[PDB]
Amino acid sequence: AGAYVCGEETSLLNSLEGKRGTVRAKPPLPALKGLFGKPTVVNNLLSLAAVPWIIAHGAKAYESFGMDRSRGTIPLQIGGNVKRGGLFETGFGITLGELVEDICGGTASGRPVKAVQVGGPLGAYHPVSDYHLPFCYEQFAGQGGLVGHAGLVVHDDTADMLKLARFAMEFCAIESCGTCTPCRIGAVRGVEVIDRIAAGDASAMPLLDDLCQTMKLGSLCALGGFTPYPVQSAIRHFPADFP
Amino acid sequence: PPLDWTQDMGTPKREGAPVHLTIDGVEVTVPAGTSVLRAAAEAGISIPKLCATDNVEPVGSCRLCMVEIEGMRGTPTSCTTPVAPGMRVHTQTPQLQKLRRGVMELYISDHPLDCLTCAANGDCELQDMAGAVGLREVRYQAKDTHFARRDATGPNPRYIPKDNSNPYFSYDPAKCIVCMRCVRACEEVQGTFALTVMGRGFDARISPAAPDFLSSDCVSCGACVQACPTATLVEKSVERIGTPERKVVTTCAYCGVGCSFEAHMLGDQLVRMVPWKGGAANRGHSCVKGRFAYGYATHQDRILKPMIRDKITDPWREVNWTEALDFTATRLRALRDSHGADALGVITSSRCTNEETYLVQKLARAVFGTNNTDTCARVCHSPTGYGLKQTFGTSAGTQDFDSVEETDLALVIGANPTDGHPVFASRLRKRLRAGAKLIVVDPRRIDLLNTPHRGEAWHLQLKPGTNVAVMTAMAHVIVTEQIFDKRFIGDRCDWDEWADYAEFVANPEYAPEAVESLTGVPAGLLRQAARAYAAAPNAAIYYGLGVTEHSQGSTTVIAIANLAMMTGNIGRPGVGVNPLRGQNNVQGSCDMGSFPHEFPGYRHVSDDATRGLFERTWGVTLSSEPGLRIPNMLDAAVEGRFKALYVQGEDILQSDPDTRHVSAGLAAMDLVIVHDLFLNETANYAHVFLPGSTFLEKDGTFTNAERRINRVRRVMAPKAGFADWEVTQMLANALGAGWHYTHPSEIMAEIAATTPGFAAVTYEMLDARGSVQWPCNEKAPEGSPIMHVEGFVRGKGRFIRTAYLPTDEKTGPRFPLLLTTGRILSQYNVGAQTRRTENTVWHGEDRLEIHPTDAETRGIRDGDWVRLASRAGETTLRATVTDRVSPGVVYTTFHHPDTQANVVTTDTSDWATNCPEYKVTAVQVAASNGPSDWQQDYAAQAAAARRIE
Amino acid sequence: PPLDWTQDMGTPKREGAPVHLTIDGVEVTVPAGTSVLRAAAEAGISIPKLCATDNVEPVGSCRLCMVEIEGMRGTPTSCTTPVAPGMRVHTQTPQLQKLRRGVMELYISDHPLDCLTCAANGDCELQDMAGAVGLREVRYQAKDTHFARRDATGPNPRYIPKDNSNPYFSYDPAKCIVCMRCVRACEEVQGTFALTVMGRGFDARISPAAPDFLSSDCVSCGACVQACPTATLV
Amino acid sequence: TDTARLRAILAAHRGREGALLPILHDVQAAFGFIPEDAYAPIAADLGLTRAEVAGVVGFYHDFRKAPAGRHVIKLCRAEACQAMGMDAVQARLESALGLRLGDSSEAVTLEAVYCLGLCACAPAAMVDDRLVGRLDAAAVAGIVAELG
Ligand SMILES: Nc1nc2c(c(=O)[nH]1)N[C@H]1C(S)=C(S)[C@@H](COP(=O)(O)OP(=O)(O)OC[C@H]3O[C@@H](n4cnc5c(=O)[nH]c(N)nc54)[C@H](O)[C@@H]3O)O[C@H]1N2
Ligand SMILES: Nc1nc2c(c(=O)[nH]1)N[C@H]1C(S)=C(S)[C@@H](COP(=O)(O)OP(=O)(O)OC[C@H]3O[C@@H](n4cnc5c(=O)[nH]c(N)nc54)[C@H](O)[C@@H]3O)O[C@H]1N2
Ligand SMILES: NC(=O)C1=CN([C@@H]2O[C@H](COP(=O)(O)OP(=O)(O)OC[C@H]3O[C@@H](n4cnc5c(N)ncnc54)[C@H](O)[C@@H]3O)[C@@H](O)[C@H]2O)C=CC1
Ligand SMILES: Cc1cc2nc3c(=O)[nH]c(=O)nc-3n(C[C@H](O)[C@H](O)[C@H](O)COP(=O)(O)O)c2cc1C
Ligand code: SF4
Ligand code: SF4
Ligand code: SF4
Ligand code: SF4
Ligand code: SF4
Ligand code: SF4
Ligand code: SF4
Ligand code: SF4
Ligand code: FES
Ligand code: FES
Ligand code: FES
Ligand SMILES: [Mo+6]
Ligand SMILES: [S]
């Protein structure tokens, strides 16, 4: 019914139950007590699309593709300002350098790329300098970022990182169960803080950092725990746009 | 004593294996599921919490109970983090400090700085957790707020104005943090989902789906209030008056549940009353009446000085104590010498303590020299004390209210716990929502049936009166089939009698297929219900006035106990045969005599061994013959040979049947004293008047339905100068007895000395233990939470052959419809205590729940005036069309005197205890304008009699 | 054990003959010079007080411990009113409520609403006597204040900046009510008159005759601090 | 007649597990919004309380509290569609109709959806149940042409 947060397992199965998509705390897992108090196996589509292929063609074959930890093929979705968008299914270990400059050409506008946002809006803004960064959960999680559904958009030089960093919190604000404080308020406050920064205040950036930190450490779900990554990334990678 | 009582731990208590852990370097051992927060509480190390309360289950909203745990990543919550063995947790690091400060920063960025002129100053769980964590600066130049009336460019859309529609509490959302304790409480604790969270995110505001609380499904009970930390939801008496300082534990003067309270006091002015988290009866919950309605004690209409008339037509005369008592005792002795001691009598009040009760029955036996005493229980749950006595051995309950937590099925005959006993219905719904099942046998759809998240439910919507037939048929089903427990019968009951009972019941005449005609209930449904009851492991019966107040009440109760013994649902937590006692200290009253055939201890009066004990203890000669009962009193006084009466705390006019008759019998009485607070309907025929005292001014005890003895304390001071036991001894000494009591502790001592069960009772025990079940001798010193746990009292249960006798109040042409009288949540029985409050909102006029199809042909519409042309009288009343009741059934309420409802009610009564037939009366509802011929005269009398000089 | 230990009574203990009286309808027996406030404390009936402490002798500055006494005219103070035999005193009437509310109104009309981010939250004897009496509204649209940095037309002359010269406590006069417990303590208890009251009236501000506390004759000992209710000295 | 439809809808979702969402979907599809006149019967059938229903209705965005215009225009405001020039499109469209973002009317209703799966065909929209992509400042003319 139009609620991002319902992507979380708890909220999802809360929404199935006829209730409102408020995230549950996790003393019990859905596997133990999920839908209607019963044990339930919750999964992504891609994880259930590989099951038949796995069991049929043999697990060992599926175990062949991929890196040491990440095994099997992954689809890379490529959208936004990009010449050849769409989908690219392949084994891990490929760099976004190749995927964005070689495979998918460049940009629709012909301009260069200033940013590439892996993951959704819960994901960082990797610049060109990170073209030496192959795709895998581990290296991307360690290199200040994320790869979830392998999302991949693109922005050219005609983009304003401020606007995007703002849209991030604006999202976390408009999309929010409203259960825990650091996404209710933190977001709609960060959206004011960023405006203040746009003005030029200097009592904002550290404020912003502290906010981001408490949102990371305190928030209940990811939507208010990963939201800071876009911001901090746009700020530390693209300082020439944040006065 | 426990910590749960004084301290608000974080999360509820869990049962399980012991588990050792180290909270902040301190060893703790607690059950498994138990949280970190509760453990840390138990260990003395306090953690910052706003959204976590014991009443409810925890939710990670505030995020302020974050802690660092070895073996975990990040800063998880303690509210949600269950302990595990060998777990080592840290409670206060620099990191956590920073985060908590940040969170409070965010909170307060959207909060007004109206502390220091807010109601909840000194009692806000936000303020004290904002000083705890160490907040010193807020850096967010906020623009989007909820409290600000005026934003930039104009008004704030987010601003929601206050809501003072409710007369007892107020909702100011400007100060709402969205902890949602309010919701959680109305949905987990009470059980009526009246509150929700409208919106997604910052726009999330608490709200009842209505313009105002009043219009909503919210009744009251200030659970929502008791839990709100931040003065958003606040009691008005705290807005007007200041925030309190001290607390004093008492009990409610209502409902017989014994909901214990702690009265908050600022000097001597009662600011509010809030539950205690004690008493097995209420674990921190309440209703509207107890929580809020305590303003009758401060009404202008209360009477504070004695008054004497010397003739009912003549006006009153405000008078001191001495000459009043002189007059009284003079007339009394005169009458005692003229017509005999048997020409006197009393009427005890359940509303009063058990001490005063004991004193009154003494006054009636020791002094007057008779056995003519009585109480309200003749009309509420007398048949009970006969049936359960003939079967088990006790005229009392079987279990606590904590037992229901363990049941797997609830069979409810003749009760409406949502209105009668709210706090019990809550605990019932808590169990219903947790899977348990329900059978309801009323003819009137009760709100217990329409509880939310209900499990399975069967409803036997029968015809009133036919309550034994149904039980007999249940038993027929169980015996025809073979579902009963044979082990139980052989062990705890007799077999010779079981055979006879089975052979009796097994008859096909008592089968569901035949009774369906006269009963109105279907057959299959009944069979199903019976199978379900008989099948369940632990089932429990909770019955009330639908069984008792009939021409066959004792019979029905007996049938019920038979079922309970047959199936095996006795002598265990989770099962039993629980009658829902009504008034406070009905049980105490009946236990301390207050019956004309017994002494304190349900010991008959003809027992010489007991009469001797008491003659010795009181130093006076007593009578061996049993006294009269109220109906007997009135018939006598009509006929003569009854001239005196000392009515303590009861309205014999509005709260008794055949009002005409009772009036005519009360008039033909040379003296009828009154000992109430206000000028009741009874005082319209009185010669004397004595002020009483409220439960706030008293000191003593109250013995509730689960036999618990709650203690009552003194917070105020008697406005009339003397409580009721004081007055009683005044009167007695004035007559010539010569008692000397300075404190009711002495009286309780006397009682412990005389009657068994109370031998171990002492005020210090009540103070320490918190409460006691009255069977507390050297055996069972702690108390007896459950009766019949090891074999029955008489030794062996008894099976009795019940049959359905067609009632005499059958219906005909001129009296085609039936009638039923009942209750409401807001108002108490006659509302002397309650009409003098702000509860005339939910119910300010009595109304008639008629059926549509039974109205169309009459021409009735909602809001129209009708007349109840019955046999024993006539009355006018406002109507209300509803499919709640079945066709050919009508429901009224007697809470208001402006309407005279018991005048309709007939003299017919039970065979054993003579409890009247309230729940059945052949009537004729028709349309009318002129109010009545009786009501007019009544008002005339009341006006010409309630005038003072 | 004694009550003096856990509870801050109003006035010091006096020696003398026993004296019986009735505080709010409760019998009390106490030495002669003993006040009404201390007696009422001993009896459990609490009376609203801000400027009265046991460490020192009482002074009628707050005027919030007013009570109605039979045989007296008006609403005299309990801090200053010594008991006498057969005295019957009333502690909470409508009149007194009104007056106390008014006094707190006046106080708070010159106080910042920095509760909830002040140091002495949960431990301010002003906050808890403002909730006790039942304050719910302030009607004075104040212009002359001490806390306001920025008045109209410019800076506030009355505003005195904080003084953190001392490494152990701090003086923020913005929150000063002039109860003068600080003074009374440094002069009665300790005995080094380092503190005084500079000014006459609204302009009266606590001060040591020096730019800062450190430069003063104030050594330390936080008597001044132990007695300040309102986080001014903290 | 509304009661009949509602009853039909409720009968159609009888015995289901957690059937509040579907029922509401259908109720909306029928009328165009969830009228407060229909918070109660739902609860009565499902054994809920008016409050729970209203809360559910309030939480989710796809349940209209008030009806829309004859036409409806959802316009992505997400990352990708933003990248390939959604702002300009938005501007042109809201100048054409004269209706800003979120502001409705009896004629039309412009609102945001925050994705449609058309992340490559970046500038995307949903006009009256018809998806559109590659919305440059020209196709908007055709968008408005079929839409008065
Ligand atoms: N707020 C509030 N609380 C109260 C009270 C109050 O007035 N207001 N009253 C107090 C007292 S003194 C009382 S007695 C207690 C107990 O009071 P309850 O035990 O709750 O008795 P009632 O509510 O009158 O009705 C019980 C149910 O049985 C129905 N009934 C009628 N005829 C029959 C019949 O033939 N067979 C069956 N199976 N059912 C029938 C009645 O219509 C009703 O639905 O509550 C106490 N608590
Ligand atoms: N039509 C119909 N009639 C019924 C019933 C019904 O359901 N329908 N129910 C029957 C049953 S269940 C019962 S319990 C009766 C109850 O009906 P009542 O006997 O009327 O009991 P209460 O309403 O408590 O009022 C009794 C009086 O005592 C006074 N009182 C209260 N507290 C004190 C105190 O502390 N000290 C003193 N000295 N006085 C006090 C109250 O102010 C009040 O005037 O009604 C019976 N009559
Ligand atoms: N403070 C913050 O910033 C927080 C962020 N997050 C992050 O969000 C990301 C993904 O979100 P979620 O899917 O909500 O959590 P998750 O990734 O921890 O769980 C993964 C899936 O497996 C299941 N699962 C987890 N532990 C299991 C066990 N022991 N046995 C069986 N099944 C188990 C869960 O039900 C879930 O469906 C995670 O990386 C998590 O770290 C989540 C919580 C708070
Ligand atoms: C805000 C948010 C949105 C999410 N959206 C999705 C989603 O669209 N699809 C998905 O499979 N998991 C989503 N998740 C992750 C779920 O919590 C869960 O991990 C996933 O549904 C399980 O599938 P897997 O076992 O294949 O990972 C989301 C989590 C969060 C916090
Ligand atoms: S971070 Fe936001 S969306 Fe996630 S649980 Fe907290 S309030 Fe809900
Ligand atoms: S609710 Fe508590 S924190 Fe908020 S203004 Fe009132 S007292 Fe202060
Ligand atoms: S007072 Fe009781 S019924 Fe009313 S909203 Fe609060 S918890 Fe619910
Ligand atoms: S009304 Fe009170 S209890 Fe309910 S969310 Fe607001 S602050 Fe919490
Ligand atoms: S439930 Fe009964 S005992 Fe408890 S507060 Fe209400 S009326 Fe009093
Ligand atoms: S001194 Fe006391 S009243 Fe003044 S701001 Fe601080 S806590 Fe509040
Ligand atoms: S701390 Fe300094 S100013 Fe305060 S009482 Fe002690 S010596 Fe005096
Ligand atoms: S500094 Fe403190 S003790 Fe001294 S007058 Fe001011 S508030 Fe009172
Ligand atoms: S503190 Fe445990 S979540 Fe609120
Ligand atoms: S209260 Fe006694 S004068 Fe301050
Ligand atoms: S981002 Fe608008 S199409 Fe997915
Ligand atoms: Mo009763
Ligand atoms: S009763």
Numbering used by the authors:
A (entry chain B): 251 to 493
B (entry chain A): 7 to 955
C (entry chain E): 7 to 240
D (entry chain G): 2 to 149
Quote from the publication.
One of these oxidoreductases, the metal-containing formate dehydrogenase, catalyses the following redox reaction: 1 CO2+2e−+H+⇌HCOO−,E∘,=−420mV In standard state, the equilibrium of the reaction favours formate oxidation at the active site Mo or W atom, which is energetically coupled to the reduction of oxidised nicotinamide adenine dinucleotide (NAD+) in cytoplasmic FDHs e.g. from Rhodobacter capsulatus and Cupriavidus necator. The RcFDH complex forms a 360 kDa dimer of FdsABGD heterotetramers. Subunit FdsA binds the bis-MGD cofactor, which coordinates the Mo atom in the active site together with the conserved Cys386 residue. The direct electron transfer chain between bis-MGD and FMN of the heterotetramer measures 76 Å and consists of five Fe-S clusters: A1, A2, A3, A5 and B6.
In order to structurally investigate this partially reduced state of the enzyme, we determined the cryo-EM structure of RcFDH in the presence of NADH and azide at 3.2 Å resolution. The atomic model derived from this structure overlays with the coordinates of the as isolated state with a root mean square deviation of 0.31 Å over all but 20 Cα atoms of the four peptide chains. The strong similarity between both structures extends to the active site residues and cofactors, whose location and orientation are indistinguishable between the two states. The difference density between the maps of the NADH reduced and the as isolated enzyme shows a distinct density for NADH near the FMN binding site. Instead of stacking underneath the isoalloxazine ring of FMN, the nicotinamide moiety of NADH sits in front of the FMN binding pocket in hydrogen bond distance to the backbone of FdsB. In this position it blocks access to the binding pocket and also prevents FMN from disengaging from the enzyme, but it is too far away (11.6 Å) to allow for productive electron transfer between NADH and FMN. In contrast, the coordination of the adenosine diphosphate (ADP) moiety of NADH resembles that of complex I. Conserved residues Glu259 and Lys157 form hydrogen bonds to the ribose oxygens of NADH and the alcohol groups of FMN contact the second phosphate group of ADP. More importantly, the negative charge on Glu258 in FdsB repels the phosphate residues of NADH and may contribute to the non-productive positioning of the nicotinamide moiety. Our cryo-EM analysis of two different redox states of RcFDH shows that NADH reduction leads to charging of the cofactors in the absence of the second substrate at the bis-MGD.
